Amino acid sequence: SFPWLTTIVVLPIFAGSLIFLFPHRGNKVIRWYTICISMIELLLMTYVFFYHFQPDDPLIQLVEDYKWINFFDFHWRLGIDGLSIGPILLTGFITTLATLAAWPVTRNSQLFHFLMLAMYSAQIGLFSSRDLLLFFIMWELELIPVYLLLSMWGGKKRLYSATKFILYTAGGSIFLLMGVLGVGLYGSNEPTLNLETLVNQSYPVALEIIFYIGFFIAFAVKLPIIPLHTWLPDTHGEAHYSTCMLLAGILLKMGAYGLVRINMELLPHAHSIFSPWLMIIGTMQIIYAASTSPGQRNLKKRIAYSSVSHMGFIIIGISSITDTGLNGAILQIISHGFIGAALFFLAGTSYDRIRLVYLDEMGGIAIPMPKIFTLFSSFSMASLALPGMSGFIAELIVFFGLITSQKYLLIPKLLITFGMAIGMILTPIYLLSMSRQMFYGYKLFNISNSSFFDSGPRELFVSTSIFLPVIGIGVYPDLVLSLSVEKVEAILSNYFYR
């Protein structure tokens, strides 16, 4: 009866709108108020997941429907299931930790924390939206906060990166809007935008293919798909590391979530048509990004291309029409949200001390900064698909989903299985080299770098608190999969003969 999801969506942006009533200077009160709001919201989502979400239910849960515009038949409609609660919890966790890690920011702290809370609200509103136009609105609601965060707290090339990001996202999202208009106006009697009634809609093959292309262009601009990935390297490389958490851990997974929710669920026939061509694209994306990563002298650009490489396993699990492949895609979503954010955070904190960019001049950092060396090595191992971490089990489950797939027969099933395997040969080749060019060797450092130079309690806590779920999922993957084994099956139930 109580509007839980509406309260969860509204609370961060509504609380951040009141951050301008504070007449205090500095950043202390602003950052403590922002972390209070973030932790209260996190506890609210924890209560919702604990007491009102049932992982055994394949249906929509905690639905809320309020008619907002009559002409479009447009409703503020919210609802969660096994697909959305994982991204919602990840969004809350990563956004709270990014607010905590953005504490040295003393320039325009009020606007920074307001934009962080706005990003919180927009991501949560996207992940819990059951209306197509509401989905599009929540998709669009992050162009301005990320643009401002990039252009006001980014790197050397922040302005060009922000312009490229906003223009690329608008270019994808106009195709998203065209797909929304096409799907929502297909009704013979009246327009409809609810996903529940749209999941039973029947389209001709050509119109379904056109709608799939219209949605897929947007979901390939957002989730990096070759060759619509060029915004990502300069956007993530020249962004603040706290913003890089949201960019590489949350915003990248939104394209995959839209692919499951819309392309995979609403339009199954066009998805079955397009998936074998998506498999080759994902494998070539893995190889292409894992080969582009050694060519990048910049550390953050290398990490961004690593993120592009890791998105290929999600693409494969999407295109492999099995329950196991979709479960592996969700597991890789969670694993990458836990790995890329921490890697970007460590890179930013290390740059705040070393103040160097290109890898060929950052030797010997392990001598003054051993703890950040340890965390960087551990998160590289997590990136390396090492067992005991979530990445290995995610890639293994994706491999199993391909092997167990019934759509493909033998030879492609070989040539793709070999394919990503080449990727996990290329993934060490730069990553360890990165460490070898960033921590190994001897350099004579200043005496002032002997003390008060390593990561403090806050950075250690952030890295540990993102590292622990990685180990917890790599040991017991069903800490995540059990939330979405049922709903994924329902998503697969439309892909078989009926």
Ligand X SMILES: CCCCCCCCCCCCCCCC(=O)OC[C@H](CO[C@@H]1O[C@H](CS(=O)(=O)O)[C@@H](O)[C@H](O)[C@H]1O)OC(=O)CCCCCCCCCCCCCCC
Binding site for ligand LMG (CB under 6 A): 66-68, 76, 204, 206-207, 209, 213, 277, 280, 411-412, 415
Q: 69 in helix, strand or coil?
A: strand
Residues that bind ligand BCR (CB under 6 A): 89-90, 93, 334, 374-375, 378, 464, 467-469, 471-472, 479-480
Which residues face 298 on adjacent strands?
358
Could you say whether residue 468 binds ligand PGT (CB under 6 A)? Answer: yes
At its nearest, how many Å lie between ligand LMG and the CB of residue 415?
5
Q: What is the 3-state secondary structure (H, E, C) of 245-291?
A: HHHHHHHHHHHHHHHHHHHHCCCHHHHHHHHHHHHHHHHHHHHHHHH
At its nearest, how many Å lie between ligand BCR and the CB of residue 367?
18
Residues 145-164 within binding reach of ligand PGT (CB under 6 A): 145
Cβ atoms of 33 and 153 closer than 8 Å: no
At its nearest, how many Å lie between other proteins and the CB of residue 30?
10
- The residues, ordered by sequence, that sit 6+ positions from 323 with a Cβ below 8 Å of its Cβ are 401, 485, 488, 489, 492
Residues 210-249 within binding reach of other proteins (CB under 8 A): 227, 230-231, 234
Q: Between 13 and 381, name the residue whose CB sits nearer to ligand PGT.
A: 13
| Rounded distance between C-alpha atoms, residue 299 and residue 431, angstroms | 10
Any idea how long the chain is? 498
Which residue's entry shows tokens 């026939």?
269
Cα Rg, the chain, nearest whole Å: 22
Residues 80-139 within binding reach of ligand PGT (CB under 6 A): 111, 118, 121-122
Strand ranges, E, within 105-200:
none
Letters for 254-293 (x = contact with other proteins by CB under 8 A, - = none) are ------------------x---x-----------------
- The residues, ordered by sequence, that sit 6+ positions from 434 with a Cβ below 8 Å of its Cβ are 299, 302, 359, 380
Q: Between 227 and 472, name the residue whose CB sits nearer to other proteins.
A: 227
Cβ atoms of 399 and 418 closer than 8 Å: no
Could you say whether residue 389 binds ligand PGT (CB under 6 A)? Answer: no
Give the N- to C-terminal CA distance of the chain in Å, as an integer. Answer: 36
Stretch that binds ligand X, among 6-14, 91-99, 135-143, 162-170 (CB under 6 A): 162-170
2 binds, among ligand PGT, ligand X, other proteins, none (CB under 5 to 8 A by kind): none
Could you say whether residue 9 binds ligand PGT (CB under 6 A)? Answer: no
| Rounded distance between C-alpha atoms, residue 153 and residue 436, angstroms | 29
Q: 77 in helix, strand or coil?
A: strand
At its nearest, how many Å lie between ligand LMG and the CB of residue 66?
4
Q: 167 in helix, strand or coil?
A: helix
At its nearest, how many Å lie between ligand PGT and the CB of residue 464?
5
| Interacting residues with ligand X (CB under 6 A) | 159-160, 163-164, 167-168, 171
Per CB under 6 A, residues contacting ligand PGT are 13, 17, 111, 118, 121-122, 141, 144-145, 452, 454, 456-457, 460-461, 464, 468
